[PDB]
């Protein structure tokens, strides 16, 4: 009745204005099943594969997003859980999928108060050198 009409336009906005360091769209043929590490970050040299499943209330609920490529980040576990404060607090209906991808690209700046993996959180707290070394290690390991 209402659900699908948002997705097509939010998707055609890609063709109307392509993004800088990303690419979106359906993973296969399903409408609700949709599918670049920053240079100034140890993720550099890494391009990521993402799993997206819009819920039936996607225009009115935040879509849960999962990772396919393993990463070494405090706010990320092996399950690709995103500690994005927008989705669970202010995931407004006006926030585009492109805006969500931008907030993901903001992850770069790590949030220490949300230690999804506290072992990596303390390392980011004091052991940034080995943090950035191991991040590139896993970058070359998985995110070719």
């Amino acid at each position: 009745m209402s659900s699908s009409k948002r997705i097509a336009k939010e998707l055609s906005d890609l063709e109307r204005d392509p993004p800088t360091s990303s690419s979106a769209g359906p993973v296969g043929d399903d409408l609700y099943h949709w599918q670049m590490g920053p240079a100034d970050s140890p993720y550099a040299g890494g391009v990521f594969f993402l799993s997206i499943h819009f819920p039936t209330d996607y225009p009115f609920k935040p879509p849960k997003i999962s990772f396919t490529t393993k990463i070494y980040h405090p706010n990320i576990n092996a399950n690709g859980n995103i500690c994005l404060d927008i989705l669970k607090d202010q995931w407004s209906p006006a926030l585009t999928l492109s805006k969500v991808l931008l907030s993901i690209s903001s992850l770069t700046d790590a949030n220490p108060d949300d230690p999804l993996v506290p072992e990596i959180a303390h390392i980011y707290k004091t052991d940034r050198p080995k943090y950035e070394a191991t991040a590139r290690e896993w970058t070359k390991k998985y995110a070719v």
């Binding site: 690419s23 979106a24 993973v27 599918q35 391009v47 990521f48």
Partner: protein
């Protein structure tokens, strides 16, 4: 048909190709138009790395689409 290929520097090049062409053909065109080795080339489309044995029609690549090209390798 014309398409968009983006390198890691954000440099956008319009490549005029046909859907029947293979990804290997596209990478050869890229190496001709910039000299960049094809073995380092890693094309990304909608979060999908493409295969030189496959063609543009296989992955629903329409014209005016955006492709992200990723380089690799270093001084050892």
């Amino acid at each position: 048909m014309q398409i968009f290929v983006k390198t890691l520097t954000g440099k956008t090049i319009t490549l005029e190709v046909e859907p029947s062409d293979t990804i290997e053909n596209v990478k050869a065109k890229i190496q001709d138009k910039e000299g960049i080795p094809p073995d380092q080339q890693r094309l990304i489309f909608a979060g999908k790395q493409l295969e030189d044995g496959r063609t543009l029609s296989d992955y629903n690549i329409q014209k005016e689409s955006t492709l992200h090209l990723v380089l690799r390798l270093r001084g050892g």
